[PDB]
PDB file of C-alpha atoms in Angstrom:
ATOM      1  CA  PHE A 890      -1.172   7.130  -8.462  1.00 33.74           C
ATOM      2  CA  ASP A 891       2.573   6.498  -8.033  1.00 36.53           C
ATOM      3  CA  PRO A 892       4.451   9.666  -9.139  1.00 38.83           C
ATOM      4  CA  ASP A 893       7.941   8.159  -9.134  1.00 37.81           C
ATOM      5  CA  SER A 894       7.037   5.316 -11.517  1.00 36.42           C
ATOM      6  CA  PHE A 895       4.895   7.747 -13.611  1.00 36.63           C
ATOM      7  CA  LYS A 896       7.923   9.980 -14.350  1.00 38.06           C
ATOM      8  CA  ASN A 897      10.040   6.882 -15.044  1.00 35.70           C
ATOM      9  CA  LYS A 898       7.696   5.418 -17.604  1.00 34.95           C
ATOM     10  CA  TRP A 899       7.227   8.645 -19.552  1.00 36.02           C
ATOM     11  CA  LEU A 900      10.922   9.424 -19.560  1.00 34.80           C
ATOM     12  CA  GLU A 901      11.796   5.926 -20.673  1.00 36.04           C
ATOM     13  CA  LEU A 902       9.342   6.093 -23.629  1.00 35.66           C
ATOM     14  CA  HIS A 903      10.748   9.472 -24.698  1.00 36.67           C
ATOM     15  CA  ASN A 904      14.382   8.585 -24.123  1.00 34.35           C
ATOM     16  CA  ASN A 905      14.202   5.158 -25.874  1.00 35.98           C
ATOM     17  CA  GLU A 906      13.084   6.905 -29.027  1.00 36.42           C
ATOM     18  CA  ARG A 907      15.874   9.453 -28.843  1.00 38.29           C
ATOM     19  CA  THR A 908      18.610   7.038 -27.668  1.00 39.04           C
ATOM     20  CA  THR A 909      18.171   4.943 -30.829  1.00 37.43           C
ATOM     21  CA  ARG A 910      18.831   8.027 -32.938  1.00 38.21           C
ATOM     22  CA  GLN A 911      22.051   9.199 -31.187  1.00 38.25           C
ATOM     23  CA  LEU A 912      20.247  12.022 -29.391  1.00 33.35           C
ATOM     24  CA  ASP A 913      20.768  13.553 -25.947  1.00 32.29           C
ATOM     25  CA  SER A 914      18.228  12.418 -23.349  1.00 30.49           C
ATOM     26  CA  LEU A 915      15.455  14.674 -22.146  1.00 25.03           C
ATOM     27  CA  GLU A 916      15.236  15.748 -18.512  1.00 25.66           C
ATOM     28  CA  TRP A 917      12.028  15.973 -16.536  1.00 26.46           C
ATOM     29  CA  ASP A 918      10.652  19.398 -15.666  1.00 25.46           C
ATOM     30  CA  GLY A 919       7.969  19.648 -13.008  1.00 27.52           C
ATOM     31  CA  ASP A 920       6.616  22.998 -14.128  1.00 28.22           C
ATOM     32  CA  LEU A 921       5.816  21.492 -17.557  1.00 33.93           C
ATOM     33  CA  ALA A 922       4.351  18.413 -15.936  1.00 34.95           C
ATOM     34  CA  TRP A 923       2.077  20.700 -13.944  1.00 34.96           C
ATOM     35  CA  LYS A 924       0.989  22.701 -16.997  1.00 35.62           C
ATOM     36  CA  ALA A 925       0.440  19.322 -18.638  1.00 38.35           C
ATOM     37  CA  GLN A 926      -2.008  18.359 -15.973  1.00 39.38           C
ATOM     38  CA  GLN A 927      -3.759  21.737 -16.199  1.00 40.66           C
ATOM     39  CA  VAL A 928      -4.485  20.932 -19.851  1.00 40.57           C
ATOM     40  CA  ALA A 929      -5.190  17.260 -19.152  1.00 40.60           C
ATOM     41  CA  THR A 930      -7.846  18.179 -16.530  1.00 43.61           C
ATOM     42  CA  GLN A 931     -10.054  19.973 -19.097  1.00 44.13           C
ATOM     43  CA  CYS A 932     -11.013  16.626 -20.832  1.00 43.43           C
ATOM     44  CA  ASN A 933     -10.717  18.496 -24.148  1.00 42.37           C
ATOM     45  CA  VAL A 934      -8.334  17.080 -26.765  1.00 42.20           C
ATOM     46  CA  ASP A 935      -9.659  19.226 -29.663  1.00 40.04           C
ATOM     47  CA  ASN A 936     -10.048  22.682 -28.040  1.00 40.30           C
ATOM     48  CA  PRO A 937      -7.873  23.054 -24.931  1.00 43.42           C
ATOM     49  CA  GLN A 938      -7.632  26.457 -23.223  1.00 40.70           C
ATOM     50  CA  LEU A 939      -3.927  27.369 -23.285  1.00 38.96           C
ATOM     51  CA  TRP A 940      -1.781  29.982 -21.646  1.00 40.04           C
ATOM     52  CA  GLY A 941       1.870  31.059 -22.022  1.00 39.31           C
ATOM     53  CA  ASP A 942       4.417  31.632 -24.820  1.00 38.78           C
ATOM     54  CA  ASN A 943       5.050  27.885 -25.023  1.00 39.93           C
ATOM     55  CA  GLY A 944       1.349  27.145 -24.601  1.00 37.88           C
ATOM     56  CA  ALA A 945       1.062  25.071 -27.794  1.00 36.77           C
ATOM     57  CA  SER A 946       4.296  23.171 -27.276  1.00 38.21           C
ATOM     58  CA  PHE A 947       2.705  19.874 -26.256  1.00 38.99           C
ATOM     59  CA  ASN A 948       1.420  16.459 -27.309  1.00 41.28           C
ATOM     60  CA  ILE A 949      -2.027  15.155 -26.312  1.00 41.48           C
ATOM     61  CA  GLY A 950      -3.501  11.645 -26.532  1.00 40.70           C
ATOM     62  CA  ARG A 951      -5.967   9.119 -25.168  1.00 39.59           C
ATOM     63  CA  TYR A 952      -5.650   5.755 -23.239  1.00 36.53           C
ATOM     64  CA  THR A 953      -2.448   4.178 -21.797  1.00 38.60           C
ATOM     65  CA  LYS A 954       0.965   5.822 -21.912  1.00 37.37           C
ATOM     66  CA  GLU A 955       2.308   3.331 -24.490  1.00 35.68           C
ATOM     67  CA  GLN A 956      -0.703   3.710 -26.788  1.00 41.09           C
ATOM     68  CA  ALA A 957      -0.647   7.512 -26.597  1.00 42.46           C
ATOM     69  CA  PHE A 958       3.078   7.700 -27.228  1.00 38.37           C
ATOM     70  CA  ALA A 959       2.905   5.269 -30.144  1.00 37.90           C
ATOM     71  CA  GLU A 960       0.169   7.292 -31.794  1.00 40.27           C
ATOM     72  CA  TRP A 961       2.525  10.292 -31.739  1.00 41.09           C
ATOM     73  CA  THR A 962       5.605   8.438 -33.037  1.00 42.79           C
ATOM     74  CA  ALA A 963       3.478   6.863 -35.819  1.00 46.20           C
ATOM     75  CA  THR A 964       3.442  10.340 -37.438  1.00 45.96           C
ATOM     76  CA  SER A 965       7.198  10.105 -38.231  1.00 46.04           C
ATOM     77  CA  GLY A 966       6.382   8.772 -41.728  1.00 45.46           C
ATOM     78  CA  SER A 967       5.618  12.180 -43.260  1.00 45.67           C
ATOM     79  CA  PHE A 968       8.483  14.166 -41.760  1.00 46.10           C
ATOM     80  CA  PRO A 969       8.986  17.072 -42.308  1.00 47.75           C
ATOM     81  CA  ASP A 970       5.382  17.956 -42.998  1.00 46.97           C
ATOM     82  CA  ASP A 971       3.075  19.449 -40.411  1.00 43.19           C
ATOM     83  CA  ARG A 972       1.326  16.092 -39.884  1.00 43.95           C
ATOM     84  CA  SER A 973       4.497  14.758 -38.215  1.00 44.02           C
ATOM     85  CA  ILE A 974       4.833  17.477 -35.628  1.00 46.74           C
ATOM     86  CA  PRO A 975       3.918  15.133 -32.744  1.00 48.90           C
ATOM     87  CA  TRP A 976       6.916  13.037 -33.540  1.00 50.45           C
ATOM     88  CA  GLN A 977       9.006  16.122 -34.151  1.00 52.57           C
ATOM     89  CA  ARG A 978       8.420  17.386 -30.610  1.00 51.02           C
ATOM     90  CA  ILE A 979       9.824  14.170 -29.215  1.00 56.31           C
ATOM     91  CA  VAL A 980      12.962  13.969 -31.331  1.00 56.86           C
ATOM     92  CA  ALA A 981      13.859  17.573 -31.902  1.00 57.69           C
ATOM     93  CA  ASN A 982      17.522  18.162 -31.321  1.00 55.74           C
ATOM     94  CA  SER A 983      16.868  21.487 -29.619  1.00 58.82           C
ATOM     95  CA  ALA A 984      14.380  20.001 -27.145  1.00 59.52           C
ATOM     96  CA  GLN A 985      15.760  19.631 -23.622  1.00 58.66           C
ATOM     97  CA  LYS A 986      12.928  19.042 -21.194  1.00 58.48           C
ATOM     98  CA  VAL A 987       9.613  17.183 -20.963  1.00 57.97           C
ATOM     99  CA  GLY A 988       6.857  17.022 -18.403  1.00 57.28           C
ATOM    100  CA  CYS A 989       3.754  14.903 -18.587  1.00 56.67           C
ATOM    101  CA  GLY A 990       0.448  14.823 -16.718  1.00 56.54           C
ATOM    102  CA  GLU A 991      -2.803  12.909 -16.744  1.00 58.24           C
ATOM    103  CA  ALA A 992      -6.487  13.034 -15.962  1.00 53.69           C
ATOM    104  CA  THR A 993      -9.220  10.428 -15.855  1.00 52.94           C
ATOM    105  CA  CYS A 994     -12.243  11.496 -17.926  1.00 53.96           C
ATOM    106  CA  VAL A 995     -15.485   9.676 -18.602  1.00 51.45           C
ATOM    107  CA  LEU A 996     -17.371   8.789 -21.757  1.00 53.08           C
ATOM    108  CA  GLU A 997     -20.830   9.806 -20.515  1.00 52.39           C
ATOM    109  CA  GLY A 998     -22.499   6.805 -18.788  1.00 50.51           C
ATOM    110  CA  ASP A 999     -20.157   4.238 -20.348  1.00 50.98           C
ATOM    111  CA  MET A1000     -16.506   4.042 -19.292  1.00 52.11           C
ATOM    112  CA  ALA A1001     -13.510   6.033 -18.046  1.00 53.78           C
ATOM    113  CA  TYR A1002     -10.512   6.769 -20.269  1.00 57.86           C
ATOM    114  CA  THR A1003      -7.147   8.332 -19.357  1.00 58.06           C
ATOM    115  CA  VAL A1004      -6.013  11.556 -21.072  1.00 64.86           C
ATOM    116  CA  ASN A1005      -2.297  12.131 -21.491  1.00 62.44           C
ATOM    117  CA  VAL A1006      -0.430  15.376 -22.065  1.00 59.28           C
ATOM    118  CA  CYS A1007       3.268  16.057 -22.390  1.00 59.54           C
ATOM    119  CA  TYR A1008       4.892  19.475 -22.596  1.00 60.35           C
ATOM    120  CA  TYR A1009       8.234  20.229 -24.242  1.00 60.72           C
ATOM    121  CA  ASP A1010      10.903  22.868 -23.800  1.00 62.68           C
ATOM    122  CA  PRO A1011      12.271  24.672 -25.738  1.00 63.47           C
ATOM    123  CA  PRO A1012       9.242  24.866 -27.990  1.00 62.05           C
ATOM    124  CA  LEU A1013       9.454  23.564 -31.558  1.00 62.13           C
ATOM    125  CA  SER A1014      10.703  26.096 -34.134  1.00 62.66           C
ATOM    126  CA  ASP A1015      11.650  26.049 -37.809  1.00 65.64           C
ATOM    127  CA  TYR A1016      13.163  22.979 -39.528  1.00 66.86           C
ATOM    128  CA  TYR A1017      16.734  24.304 -39.348  1.00 67.49           C
ATOM    129  CA  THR A1018      16.658  25.461 -35.724  1.00 65.09           C
ATOM    130  CA  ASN A1019      15.208  22.183 -34.536  1.00 61.07           C
ATOM    131  CA  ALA A1020      18.195  20.159 -35.640  1.00 62.37           C
ATOM    132  CA  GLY A1021      20.795  22.767 -34.584  1.00 63.79           C
TER     133      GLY A1021
END
């Protein structure tokens, strides 16, 4: 595990997407990244145990960073419906900060797959607030 490159890759993926669209870059926040790992550690994509006011303000996904990120941005198509929220978290105007974390989990007696989680601050709100 190389932390410095880890932060770089995640930030680049996020900031590429927003740079294209004339948006301010996101800054890394360690606290979020920690919380991200707390959630990542559980090996539970469907029913994570969450804590905090911003507990739900996160994306979750399987495999490599690129694959996981793409799967979120792929949801752009149906904006502004609730199916596109993954993508909304990434490109919300209001959003300032991201932190990501990972965990290696195992398909029982088969193979190991990475789990990725990113947290966002401020958390996503209503349609109007998000673009403010």
